[PDB]
């Protein structure tokens, strides 16, 4: 259903906002425990620094020794107790409950494919989509290099090397312009050189594999692809 797709995402948004509230209350709980523990450690720093500057005179008076015995026997356990106290259960329970209502792998490919379909439908280059310049629409939204990478991967699994090539290039461009990302250029060139190969651009595939090996000279498949590419080309002659 088209309008039930939107109703489902809208519901998912309300669910996700609530997960954020539960998450913020969790953070608030950790900060309070950590602040208590922090105060407690500092207090312990004072007791120990002053002790260590004359340990023998300190330990003989038995009142101090009594204090020393009690801290390790009793106060450090209370601290272990405070330290071991889990503050995340409220949040985790809630999230565990909410994941029943979460989307799966299939919903994620669907959204990816709808992006590929709008791109094909409106004839957009990938940089336009990523930069949020869609046929008038505000507000702008953007794709990370890693988003680009994922779209490249959805196309790939369907053996759509046209879109695979396109999105890996988009990811690559963004890494090259200097975007900080969890995705690395070698992974992209791996997929990219490959898509270029299925599509019969032997030259481009050879070049890209060389760029990969520049970054990773011991990349096992890229080394194999290099020898292979070079072989077929010498034989097309």
């Amino acid at each position: 259903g088209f309008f039930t797709s939107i109703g489902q995402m809208t519901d998912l948004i309300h669910t996700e906002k609530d997960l954020v509230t539960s998450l913020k209350d969790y953070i608030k709980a950790e900060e309070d425990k950590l602040e208590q523990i922090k105060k407690w450690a500092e207090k312990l720093d004072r007791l120990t620094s002053t002790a260590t500057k004359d340990p023998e005179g300190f330990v003989g008076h038995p009142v101090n020794a009594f204090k020393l015995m009690k801290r390790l026997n009793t106060e450090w356990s209370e601290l272990e107790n405070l330290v071991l106290k889990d503050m995340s259960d409220g949040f985790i329970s809630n999230l565990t409950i909410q994941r029943q209502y979460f989307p799966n792998d299939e919903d994620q490919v669907g959204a990816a494919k709808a992006l590929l379909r709008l791109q094909d439908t409106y004839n957009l280059d990938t940089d336009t989509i990523s930069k949020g310049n869609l046929p008038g629409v505000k507000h702008k939204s953007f794709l990370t290099a890693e988003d680009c990478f994922e779209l490249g991967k959805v196309a790939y699994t369907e053996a759509d090397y046209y879109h695979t090539e396109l999105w890996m290039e988009q990811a690559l461009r963004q890494l090259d312009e200097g975007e900080i990302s969890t995705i690395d250029k070698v992974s992209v060139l791996d997929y990219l050189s490959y898509a270029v190969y299925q599509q019969g651009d032997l030259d481009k595939a050879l070049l890209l594999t060389k760029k990969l090996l520049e970054l990773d000279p011991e990349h096992q498949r890229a080394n194999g692809n290099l020898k292979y590419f070079e072989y077929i080309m010498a034989k097309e002659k």
Binding site: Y156, D190, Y191, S193, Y194, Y197, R221, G224, N225, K227, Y228, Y231
Partner: peptide, 9 residues
């Protein structure tokens, strides 16, 4: 003779 590219993959 070399072998063909595997999936990246």
């Amino acid at each position: 003779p070399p072998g063909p590219p595997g999936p990246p993959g």
